[PDB]
Paper text:
The transcription-repair coupling factor (TRCF) recognizes paused/stalled RNAPs and either rescues transcription or initiates transcription termination. The bacterial TRCF – Mfd is a multi-domain adaptor protein consisting of seven domains connected by flexible linkers. Domains 5 and 6 together form the motor domain, representing a (helicase) superfamily II ATPase that exhibits structural homology to the RecG translocase. Further, biophysical studies revealed that the motor domain of Mfd binds and partially melts DNA containing a template strand overhang.
Residue numbers in the entry: 575 to 956
Write the structure that this text describes.
DNA sequence: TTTTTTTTTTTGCCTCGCTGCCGTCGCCA
DNA sequence: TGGCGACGGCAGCGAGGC
């Protein structure tokens, strides 16, 4: 229940500081309070019931990863459910770069899950020496083996109902979890968790506060070309979204015709994992100045070199797509840009004008949706 | 109180769309 | 010649507004 007594989690502050001093970002007081609360809850023999909210942008995603020191010394396993493969690979790369100079062993599962990869995963879960695990779409239903589960983090529960939460709750044999949603969610679940899980809303906008230009205009090729010319001034990056059903090759050809001075790569979704890895390598090496991603299978996180985000399909929207894209924008120590095209919504044609007026008066997701979430959590929980 | 003021709105939601999976085929021993 | 891994299609998929 609420108590969920655990074991000894001695801090060893000197080694933690020696391992964490290499962080290339000055800690702000609110982040220091957050990490202090996290380490106090870890050392506390009670449940790992801490609620911390962070976005998908860099800086708000590896702050909770400092618990790796507390999860290695006790010699326990931890897991995280990365929804896609590119994000899983980026996370693995930065984790192994940050935690290189000590004998840690980390493996993960991706779209490369052939027979050899499955045998390797079976061997690693039979050994148990592996510290950190990263899952995929089919992680929940798969029989994942754990001998000593330290903690676990899982988010992005918008593309499906409440089934994975209870499935992972059925996997809580003498272990605790730190499940939290990065994207905003209705606060009824937060109120239900309240009274057992401590509420810690650090809410740090600063330490990366730069100018952000977000606008919206009518569909037009000239404005898109002007934005491309503005962003290619320092090797920036934009993203173009598509239904991934029609001729994405023709869309890319049209983009190349619009800007022949740039080099557009292949940003087609649902392709081979090898091609996805090549696309990630191209993004890391900045070989192609222009590269686009269409859906959640492709758009999972923002790139620090990226500076402009453009949305073209304002007539057909996705309930989960909007939530995913409302958390994947940011930049460090540079100006940020954003624009949106406004095609006329058409469908049953009964309320096309009403839909257009609503899009014009969108008011940033109904103005204060946080107020509505608070008003719902006050009224009820769960 | 029609589907929306996209919201103090309950169990209704239709809608094109994501996907685990099963069968089939090329390949290697 | 047989077993295997990659590939393609399809009906199920929590229970979810335009």
């Amino acid at each position: 229940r609420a108590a969920k007594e655990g074991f000894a989690f001695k801090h060893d502050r000197e080694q933690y500081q020696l391992f964490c001093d290499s962080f290339p970002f000055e800690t702000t007081p609110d982040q220091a309070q957050a990490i202090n609360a996290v380490l106090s809850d870890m050392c506390q023999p009670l449940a790992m019931d801490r609620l911390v909210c962070g976005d998908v942008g860099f800086g708000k995603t590896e702050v909770a990863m400092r618990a790796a020191f507390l999860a290695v010394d006790n010699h326990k396993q931890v897991a995280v459910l990365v929804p896609t493969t590119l994000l899983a690979q980026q996370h693995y790369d930065n984790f192994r770069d940050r935690f290189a100079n000590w004998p840690v062993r980390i493996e993960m599962i991706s779209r490369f899950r052939s027979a050899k990869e499955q045998t390797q995963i079976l061997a690693e879960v039979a050994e148990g020496k592996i510290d950190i695990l990263i899952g995929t779409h089919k992680l929940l239903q798969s029989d994942v083996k754990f001998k000593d589960l330290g903690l676990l983090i899982v988010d992005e529960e918008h593309r499906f109902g409440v089934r994975h939460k209870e499935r992972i709750k059925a996997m809580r044999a003498n272990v605790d979890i730190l499940t939290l949603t990065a994207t905003p969610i209705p606060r009824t679940l937060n109120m239900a968790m309240s009274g057992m899980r401590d509420l810690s809303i650090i809410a740090t906008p600063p330490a990366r506060r730069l100018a952000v230009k977000t606008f919206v205009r009518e569909y037009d090729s000239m404005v898109v070309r002007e934005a491309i010319l503005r962003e290619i001034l320092r090797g920036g990056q934009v993203y173009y979204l598509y239904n991934d059903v029609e001729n994405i090759q023709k869309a890319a050809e049209r983009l190349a015709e619009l800007v022949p001075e740039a080099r557009i790569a292949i940003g087609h979704g649902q392709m081979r994992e090898r091609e996805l890895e090549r696309v990630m390598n191209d993004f890391h090496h900045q070989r192609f100045n222009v590269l686009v991603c269409t859906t959640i299978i492709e758009t999972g996180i923002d790139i620090p070199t990226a500076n402009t985000i453009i949305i073209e399909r304002a007539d057909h929207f996705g309930l989960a797509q909007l939530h995913q894209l409302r958390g994947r924008v940011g930049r460090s120590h540079h100006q940020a840009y954003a624009w949106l095209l406004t095609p006329h919504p058409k469908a049953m044609t009964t309320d096309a004008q009403k839909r257009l007026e609503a899009i014009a008066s969108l008011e940033d997701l109904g103005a204060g949706f946080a107020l509505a979430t608070h008003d719902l959590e006050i009224r009820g929980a769960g």
